[PDB]
Amino acid sequence: MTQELLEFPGGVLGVALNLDEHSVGAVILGEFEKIEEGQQVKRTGEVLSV
Amino acid sequence: ASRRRAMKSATDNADDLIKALTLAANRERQAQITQEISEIVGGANAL
Amino acid sequence: TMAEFFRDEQGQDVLLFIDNIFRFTQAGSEVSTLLGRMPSAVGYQPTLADEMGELQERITSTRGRSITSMQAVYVPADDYTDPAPATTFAHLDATTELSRAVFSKGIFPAVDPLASSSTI
Amino acid sequence: TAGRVVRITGPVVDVEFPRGSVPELFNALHAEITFGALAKTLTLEVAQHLGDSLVRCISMQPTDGLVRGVEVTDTGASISVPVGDGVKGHVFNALGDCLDDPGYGKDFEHWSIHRKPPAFSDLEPRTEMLETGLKVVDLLTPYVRGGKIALFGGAGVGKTVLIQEMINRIARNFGGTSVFAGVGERTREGNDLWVELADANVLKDTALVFGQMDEPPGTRMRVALSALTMAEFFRDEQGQDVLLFIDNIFRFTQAGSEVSTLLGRMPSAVGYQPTLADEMGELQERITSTRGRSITSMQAVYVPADDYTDPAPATTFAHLDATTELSRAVFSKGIFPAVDPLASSSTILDPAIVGDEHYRVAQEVIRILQRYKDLQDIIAILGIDELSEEDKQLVNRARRIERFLSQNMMAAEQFTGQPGSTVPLKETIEAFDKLTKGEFDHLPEQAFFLIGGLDDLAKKAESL
Amino acid sequence: QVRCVYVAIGQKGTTIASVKRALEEGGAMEYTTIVAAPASDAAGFKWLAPYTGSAIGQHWMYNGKHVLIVFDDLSKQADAYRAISLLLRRPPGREAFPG
Amino acid sequence: DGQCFLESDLFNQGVRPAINVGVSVSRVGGAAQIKAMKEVAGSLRLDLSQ
Amino acid sequence: IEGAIEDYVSSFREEIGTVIDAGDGIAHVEGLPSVMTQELLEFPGGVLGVALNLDEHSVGAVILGEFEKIEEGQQVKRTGEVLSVPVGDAFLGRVVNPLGQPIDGQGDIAAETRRALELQAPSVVQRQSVSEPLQTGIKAIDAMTPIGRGQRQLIIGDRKTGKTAVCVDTILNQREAWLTGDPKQQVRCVYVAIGQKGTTIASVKRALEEGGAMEYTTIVAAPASDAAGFKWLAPYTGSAIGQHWMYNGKHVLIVFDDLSKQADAYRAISLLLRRPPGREAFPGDVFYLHSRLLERCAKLSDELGGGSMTGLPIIETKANDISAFIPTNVISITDGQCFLESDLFNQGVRPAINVGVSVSRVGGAAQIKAMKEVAGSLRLDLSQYRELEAFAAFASDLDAASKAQLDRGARLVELLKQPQYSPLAVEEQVVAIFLGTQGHLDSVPVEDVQRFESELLEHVKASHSDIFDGIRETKKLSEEAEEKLVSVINEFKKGFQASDGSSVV
Amino acid sequence: SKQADAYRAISLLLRRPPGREAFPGDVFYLHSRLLERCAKLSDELGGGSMTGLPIIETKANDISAFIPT
Ligand SMILES: Nc1ncnc2c1ncn2[C@@H]1O[C@H](COP(=O)(O)OP(=O)(O)OP(=O)(O)O)[C@@H](O)[C@H]1O
Ligand SMILES: Nc1ncnc2c1ncn2[C@@H]1O[C@H](COP(=O)(O)OP(=O)(O)OP(=O)(O)O)[C@@H](O)[C@H]1O
Ligand SMILES: [Mg+2]
Ligand SMILES: [Mg+2]
């Protein structure tokens, strides 16, 4: 979903800004030196909330 | 007699301000136009 | 090329007259931008010095024959630091001026001695 | 685990790896050059991924001599540097290899150069005032311990002389372990500094490491990180206060810009990196005095083309507390400590910290100088004749007081052939109060040019 | 009764500590809160903090209590957004800023 | 709805708040302040500017 | 399937490539499995190419010399040699193009090795202090801001001022040092001309021919009629030739005619490759380029041999504006500068040297002890004279208090003027400085002072020359020589006649 | 000026390379093709004539702009 929070294996959280045909762009919030190719991404089914 | 020389020196000193301001204005105009063209070409080529 | 042929075939000294130089650089910049290159240095072609030198290098005198030329250059926006006049003046020897006040005096040459000079 | 080189351009090198294993970010890689005349090994650092098991790396050495098909081996660790008690007293390169005595080391502790700043709960502000023999810095913008000092200025306006004078004063007055670094300095200056420190009998406790001009940008952007790592090691374990010196930080920024154009990222305003604030922030926040450790630093920063509008010093302006500025016009006037009194500002100056008299004196000096600057527009054409005497008195007072700020620091001993001077701040404030009273208008102006104290002032005035 | 919220963007931690000390001396720390986004953090927090502060204030505003909001810096957020947009390959605009 | 301009020249002149009354303005007007203040104080900005 | 790909990669009679692109002096060639960064590629037309880029399937290349000989379908053959220039001890007395081909036409040349154009540089531990004087024929520069061996000095000035005159004067002055056979006092000279008209090069070469000092001079020319490649490479070749004599124990002076033209050519080349621009279309590589070019010049340590190279860059600016990109960068990287402005030149004084801006960071070791002792406080006196002259229309304040100061300023201003093509030695110049400072010429009217000293000078050359030898040997001004010199001055000026025939008293 | 603006809009919409002030290179040529038609004729062809009075608008008393020059 647009602007939907996504979970990452290391415990960091991401946000999907724009949705392309076959790819999804995301921005990392916290520490981002532990991100590599081949990880697993899960959707939380919820929009950015505080 | 003392009065005359003051006006003479005043005009002589006033000319150089015109010269320096003209140089500064020309420099600023050139900088502005080159910045604008650089920005527009960079924007156009990115697509 | 025609003047060079005259000089190198007949041995006669020749004089060359050019009306303007600004239009030459203008046409150069236009043909540069139509080929889809990248502009630089206040909307000018990136290699103007190369063409200017290639044009001016065929004027010097050699082998006992001379090719003297005269040009009339136009300064834009009354700026003497513009790239085109700056590059043009690098190959200049003598400068001459004409005005109307000297003409109002009523003499033939109408040249101001206080505004002309030479490098020799 | 064997890699293959596929594409190279400039100092940036592409590489591919087998699908099974791909090293993480910031892992050193080793390559070799087989050419006979230019044989050399190269160390690479991971920058980013591109997919298809491709990696982009930045070369630590000039890339001339490389060829496709060269095997690449990894170490599975970040760049490491040696740390220990006996490090002080030797010169180092970017990689950490010694220069005076090759082969020395490889038995001390080894730490990486990628760390994190301390937590918020360990932060604490400090307000311990530090004084220096100079009168201009102490009267207007006093220095504070545990913070940061900035020396903004143009090109060729004598920053190095001031740095040398200040470090000499601190080294003579105070001890403790000291660390000197540098980016974008001339080798002649480095040799002169080495000779001077050898003469001064103080180089034993001063750590030295620096890059120079002729180096690929990687060393220029990593020597500072190595220096901070060594300084942090001296700060934490020993529990000792440390002096830190860094010269010409602006060059660092420039280096980054270059590699950005090589990586292919979209340019920003005035052809800079898309991100520059984050790097500056993570570099600056590494320096911070904890409760049990006091660190005092001093950064000299360059200004390009004498234009303050560039983001390079503008971004740095937000991470400083004590700032001094240099101007071209003041230098052209003739006074050598060409410090702008109007533009300079500090954060420690306050009636809560300092007595009321100093505050009042500073305020009055600022007011007089500002009024003179305002009148400068009118005076520049007609002169003093058009103005009234009620402003003539202020003009004369401003001229004399501004001329009084000149001084002859000892760092010019090799230029002016005269000894230095020292002035306690009590004498300074007393003399400035006397001058602001207006009694000293009788004496000629040229007496105050390059004077040490009020006694020397009177002696010079009466001797002429 | 007035409840206030302080938001800081792109400032040194020691400045935030000094502001906290001033508030503590003033004694207002009973009825105030601080949201901190130091410059050492990534671009996401700098871009996101003001919306969090606004939502926090809005929750009390709906309940009928008066709320005061103070933003420290706002150009830093624009710079962070520009950096994010340029990194995301979006086309630029005037003064390299997103449209 | 309103802005305040602060100049360094005024700050060094001697005005500690250093607000420029010539340009600073508030769109809401005198309705916000108490009635006694508007009775005692009124049209002072015009006097300062003139 | 991985093994097949590995064997395909490892499998790789002479390699041949084909041309696919052209235009504006850029080529794209592919098909060379064995690649090499910055290798010289021989095109079938006799022209040369340099590989500044490398891709997966093809490689780009810049071209040198004539570039219209490029057509698609041509075959190109690689050469394993890295870019280099032949270097030898027979190069002196010749004129060559950047690639080393003799262009003068005198004959053929032979070399011994081929040093690379890009190598390492001396470190901090391999250097030494500056303690050797580099004498110059111009007395103004040696009296105001001295120059020593191994120290880079900058010359910045507007057009039509005469920097090449100063360089030619220095080259001529080096002949006296060349005359003796001492290796320690030996000095070689390298001149590099960039983007210059052919007539100027011919004129300077003929001037040197009149000077007769080609036995130690090497000239490299990159005329403006050539392409961008020579205009970008020539200074590097000059630096390599200089460094070859660096690393053998010889003193070298190198002169660059211009550096703005090289920067402009590099900007054109960079913009032709679609790289994003920066300030005034200048990429971020300009500072790196100039730093790499200028950092190679430094005095070596004692153990290695103690060679030295002194560099003379020349920079021109428009409308005397120091605030600019390239001038600021170059003045930042180098140390010391000399300023030449059009105002004094137009007024009438030929050597146009300002006194309030030209400051050199050189130490006092450059000047001889005698020179330091005889001359002192000149710059401050000239600055205060330039401050006082602005009030020459108001004599009601001076009133016989600074009249002697104005007289001294006038005499000193008239003394420092120098003619054309007149190199000067240390002996007569220190004598002239002493005579000017001591104020003996206060009586002589300004309209003739010059000729007077010249006569005096040659008279001292006709009379006893023991004082010259004495102050040449001990490098100091002995007192008895001072009384002898003042006595000679008195005797000469008693019998000396002025322009109007009034004897000085 | 309006004609030049319309031509610039068409050229930009047709995806052609731009130049200084977002103007196509050939724009100058355009004017040379239009304003040069009018000229005096000789008596051989009848001696016709044509006179043109183009009008240009400038802003802020500025003459150094592209089209005015
Ligand atoms: N107090 C002083 N007395 C005499 N000369 C001085 C004084 N301060 C500076 N100078 C002169 O000014 C120059 C300063 O040189 P220095 O190497 O310090 O320059 P810098 O401005 O720090 O360098 P950069 O251009 O690399 O930033 C020298 O020529 C020095 O002699
Ligand atoms: N001592 C001197 N006496 C007389 N004329 C002099 C003297 N020194 C220089 N000149 C004059 O200066 C010029 C020599 O300099 P030159 O023509 O090479 O120009 P430049 O200032 O070096 O610049 P550029 O390379 O742009 O021509 C000649 O016009 C020469 O007459
Ligand atoms: Mg410096
Ligand atoms: Mg010349």
Tab-separated table of N, CA and C in Angstrom, chain G residues 411-481:
chain	number	residue	atom	x	y	z
G	411	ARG	N	63.674	59.950	-5.635
G	411	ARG	CA	64.937	59.363	-6.074
G	411	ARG	C	64.841	57.845	-6.151
G	412	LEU	N	64.189	57.220	-5.170
G	412	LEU	CA	64.068	55.766	-5.175
G	412	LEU	C	63.163	55.289	-6.304
G	413	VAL	N	62.090	56.029	-6.591
G	413	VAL	CA	61.214	55.664	-7.700
G	413	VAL	C	61.967	55.749	-9.021
G	414	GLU	N	62.748	56.815	-9.210
G	414	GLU	CA	63.496	56.955	-10.455
G	414	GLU	C	64.674	55.990	-10.540
G	415	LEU	N	65.164	55.490	-9.406
G	415	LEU	CA	66.334	54.617	-9.427
G	415	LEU	C	65.987	53.219	-9.926
G	416	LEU	N	64.819	52.700	-9.541
G	416	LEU	CA	64.505	51.292	-9.764
G	416	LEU	C	64.129	50.967	-11.205
G	417	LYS	N	63.947	51.965	-12.066
G	417	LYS	CA	63.616	51.685	-13.458
G	417	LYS	C	64.771	50.968	-14.146
G	418	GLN	N	64.436	49.991	-14.986
G	418	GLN	CA	65.437	49.184	-15.663
G	418	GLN	C	65.157	49.143	-17.159
G	419	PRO	N	66.200	49.171	-17.991
G	419	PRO	CA	65.989	49.089	-19.443
G	419	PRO	C	65.630	47.687	-19.906
G	420	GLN	N	65.550	47.497	-21.218
G	420	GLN	CA	65.164	46.226	-21.814
G	420	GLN	C	66.400	45.412	-22.176
G	421	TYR	N	66.333	44.103	-21.917
G	421	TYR	CA	67.399	43.162	-22.267
G	421	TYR	C	68.727	43.557	-21.625
G	422	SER	N	68.675	43.938	-20.351
G	422	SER	CA	69.852	44.382	-19.605
G	422	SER	C	69.933	43.611	-18.296
G	423	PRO	N	70.393	42.362	-18.337
G	423	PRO	CA	70.620	41.625	-17.092
G	423	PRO	C	71.727	42.269	-16.276
G	424	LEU	N	71.631	42.112	-14.960
G	424	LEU	CA	72.526	42.792	-14.037
G	424	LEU	C	73.096	41.791	-13.043
G	425	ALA	N	74.322	42.049	-12.600
G	425	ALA	CA	75.025	41.169	-11.678
G	425	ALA	C	74.864	41.652	-10.239
G	426	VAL	N	75.292	40.801	-9.305
G	426	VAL	CA	75.108	41.090	-7.884
G	426	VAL	C	75.979	42.263	-7.447
G	427	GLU	N	77.187	42.371	-8.002
G	427	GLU	CA	78.142	43.371	-7.534
G	427	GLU	C	77.628	44.784	-7.778
G	428	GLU	N	77.370	45.117	-9.041
G	428	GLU	CA	76.929	46.465	-9.363
G	428	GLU	C	75.555	46.763	-8.778
G	429	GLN	N	74.691	45.753	-8.647
G	429	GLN	CA	73.372	46.017	-8.082
G	429	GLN	C	73.459	46.320	-6.589
G	430	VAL	N	74.317	45.608	-5.850
G	430	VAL	CA	74.460	45.937	-4.436
G	430	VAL	C	75.138	47.291	-4.279
G	431	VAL	N	76.070	47.631	-5.176
G	431	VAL	CA	76.676	48.960	-5.127
G	431	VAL	C	75.623	50.038	-5.357
G	432	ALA	N	74.743	49.830	-6.339
G	432	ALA	CA	73.693	50.805	-6.621
G	432	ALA	C	72.724	50.930	-5.453
G	433	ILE	N	72.370	49.807	-4.827
G	433	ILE	CA	71.475	49.853	-3.674
G	433	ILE	C	72.118	50.629	-2.531
G	434	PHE	N	73.403	50.376	-2.270
G	434	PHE	CA	74.109	51.109	-1.222
G	434	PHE	C	74.137	52.601	-1.526
G	435	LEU	N	74.441	52.955	-2.776
G	435	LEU	CA	74.505	54.360	-3.162
G	435	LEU	C	73.152	55.038	-2.998
G	436	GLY	N	72.075	54.349	-3.376
G	436	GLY	CA	70.751	54.922	-3.208
G	436	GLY	C	70.363	55.095	-1.751
G	437	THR	N	70.627	54.079	-0.924
G	437	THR	CA	70.228	54.152	0.478
G	437	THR	C	71.010	55.221	1.232
G	438	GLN	N	72.317	55.332	0.978
G	438	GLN	CA	73.122	56.293	1.724
G	438	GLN	C	72.803	57.743	1.380
G	439	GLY	N	72.047	57.993	0.313
G	439	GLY	CA	71.632	59.344	-0.008
G	439	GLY	C	72.691	60.222	-0.631
G	440	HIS	N	73.746	59.635	-1.200
G	440	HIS	CA	74.782	60.440	-1.838
G	440	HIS	C	74.261	61.149	-3.080
G	441	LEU	N	73.289	60.554	-3.771
G	441	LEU	CA	72.729	61.119	-4.990
G	441	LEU	C	71.617	62.129	-4.726
G	442	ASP	N	71.512	62.645	-3.499
G	442	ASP	CA	70.467	63.616	-3.192
G	442	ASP	C	70.655	64.914	-3.966
G	443	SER	N	71.899	65.269	-4.290
G	443	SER	CA	72.156	66.518	-4.997
G	443	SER	C	71.827	66.427	-6.482
G	444	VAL	N	71.993	65.257	-7.084
G	444	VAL	CA	71.823	65.119	-8.537
G	444	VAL	C	70.352	65.304	-8.896
G	445	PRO	N	70.026	66.117	-9.900
G	445	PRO	CA	68.624	66.259	-10.310
G	445	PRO	C	68.078	64.970	-10.906
G	446	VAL	N	66.766	64.779	-10.738
G	446	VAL	CA	66.126	63.513	-11.089
G	446	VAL	C	66.212	63.230	-12.582
G	447	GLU	N	66.315	64.272	-13.407
G	447	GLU	CA	66.229	64.098	-14.854
G	447	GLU	C	67.401	63.324	-15.444
G	448	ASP	N	68.482	63.110	-14.691
G	448	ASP	CA	69.655	62.440	-15.228
G	448	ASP	C	70.232	61.357	-14.325
G	449	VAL	N	69.698	61.178	-13.110
G	449	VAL	CA	70.315	60.285	-12.125
G	449	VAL	C	70.723	58.965	-12.768
G	450	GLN	N	69.821	58.377	-13.560
G	450	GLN	CA	70.091	57.098	-14.205
G	450	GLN	C	71.441	57.113	-14.906
G	451	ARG	N	71.588	57.972	-15.921
G	451	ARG	CA	72.831	57.972	-16.682
G	451	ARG	C	74.017	58.156	-15.751
G	452	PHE	N	73.866	59.021	-14.742
G	452	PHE	CA	74.963	59.291	-13.826
G	452	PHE	C	75.480	57.994	-13.227
G	453	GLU	N	74.581	57.209	-12.626
G	453	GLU	CA	75.043	55.994	-11.971
G	453	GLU	C	75.692	55.068	-12.986
G	454	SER	N	75.103	54.969	-14.183
G	454	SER	CA	75.696	54.132	-15.217
G	454	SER	C	77.137	54.544	-15.458
G	455	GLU	N	77.363	55.842	-15.677
G	455	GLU	CA	78.728	56.320	-15.846
G	455	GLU	C	79.573	55.919	-14.650
G	456	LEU	N	79.098	56.247	-13.445
G	456	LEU	CA	79.830	55.877	-12.243
G	456	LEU	C	80.147	54.394	-12.270
G	457	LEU	N	79.139	53.577	-12.591
G	457	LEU	CA	79.333	52.135	-12.604
G	457	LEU	C	80.496	51.767	-13.510
G	458	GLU	N	80.455	52.228	-14.764
G	458	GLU	CA	81.513	51.831	-15.681
G	458	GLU	C	82.842	52.429	-15.255
G	459	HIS	N	82.812	53.614	-14.638
G	459	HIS	CA	84.048	54.187	-14.125
G	459	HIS	C	84.661	53.272	-13.076
G	460	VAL	N	83.830	52.734	-12.178
G	460	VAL	CA	84.356	51.819	-11.175
G	460	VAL	C	84.872	50.555	-11.846
G	461	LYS	N	84.294	50.182	-12.989
G	461	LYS	CA	84.816	49.035	-13.716
G	461	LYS	C	86.147	49.364	-14.378
G	462	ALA	N	86.356	50.629	-14.747
G	462	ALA	CA	87.635	51.021	-15.332
G	462	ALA	C	88.711	51.153	-14.262
G	463	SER	N	88.340	51.645	-13.084
G	463	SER	CA	89.279	51.846	-11.990
G	463	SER	C	89.507	50.522	-11.261
G	464	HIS	N	90.114	50.598	-10.078
G	464	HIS	CA	90.384	49.403	-9.289
G	464	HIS	C	89.094	48.661	-8.965
G	465	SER	N	89.142	47.334	-9.081
G	465	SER	CA	87.998	46.472	-8.811
G	465	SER	C	88.267	45.548	-7.627
G	466	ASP	N	89.087	46.002	-6.677
G	466	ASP	CA	89.385	45.186	-5.506
G	466	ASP	C	88.189	45.082	-4.569
G	467	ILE	N	87.371	46.134	-4.488
G	467	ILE	CA	86.207	46.110	-3.605
G	467	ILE	C	85.196	45.070	-4.073
G	468	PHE	N	85.009	44.949	-5.392
G	468	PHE	CA	84.103	43.934	-5.918
G	468	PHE	C	84.556	42.538	-5.520
G	469	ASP	N	85.847	42.245	-5.692
G	469	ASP	CA	86.367	40.938	-5.307
G	469	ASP	C	86.227	40.710	-3.809
G	470	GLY	N	86.523	41.737	-3.010
G	470	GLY	CA	86.451	41.585	-1.565
G	470	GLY	C	85.050	41.267	-1.081
G	471	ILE	N	84.052	41.995	-1.589
G	471	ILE	CA	82.686	41.722	-1.159
G	471	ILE	C	82.103	40.513	-1.878
G	472	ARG	N	82.753	40.038	-2.942
G	472	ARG	CA	82.335	38.793	-3.574
G	472	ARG	C	82.835	37.571	-2.819
G	473	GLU	N	84.019	37.658	-2.212
G	473	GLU	CA	84.598	36.497	-1.544
G	473	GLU	C	83.959	36.259	-0.179
G	474	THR	N	84.008	37.260	0.699
G	474	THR	CA	83.505	37.104	2.059
G	474	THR	C	81.995	37.265	2.165
G	475	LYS	N	81.324	37.680	1.087
G	475	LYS	CA	79.868	37.847	1.071
G	475	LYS	C	79.399	38.802	2.168
G	476	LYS	N	80.188	39.843	2.424
G	476	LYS	CA	79.807	40.865	3.386
G	476	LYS	C	80.483	42.173	3.002
G	477	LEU	N	79.939	43.271	3.521
G	477	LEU	CA	80.420	44.611	3.191
G	477	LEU	C	81.450	45.029	4.234
G	478	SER	N	82.727	44.887	3.893
G	478	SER	CA	83.793	45.300	4.796
G	478	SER	C	83.855	46.820	4.893
G	479	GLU	N	84.268	47.306	6.065
G	479	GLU	CA	84.241	48.743	6.323
G	479	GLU	C	85.239	49.491	5.444
G	480	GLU	N	86.496	49.034	5.411
G	480	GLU	CA	87.516	49.737	4.637
G	480	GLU	C	87.105	49.857	3.176
G	481	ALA	N	86.431	48.832	2.652
G	481	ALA	CA	85.816	48.951	1.337
G	481	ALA	C	84.774	50.059	1.313
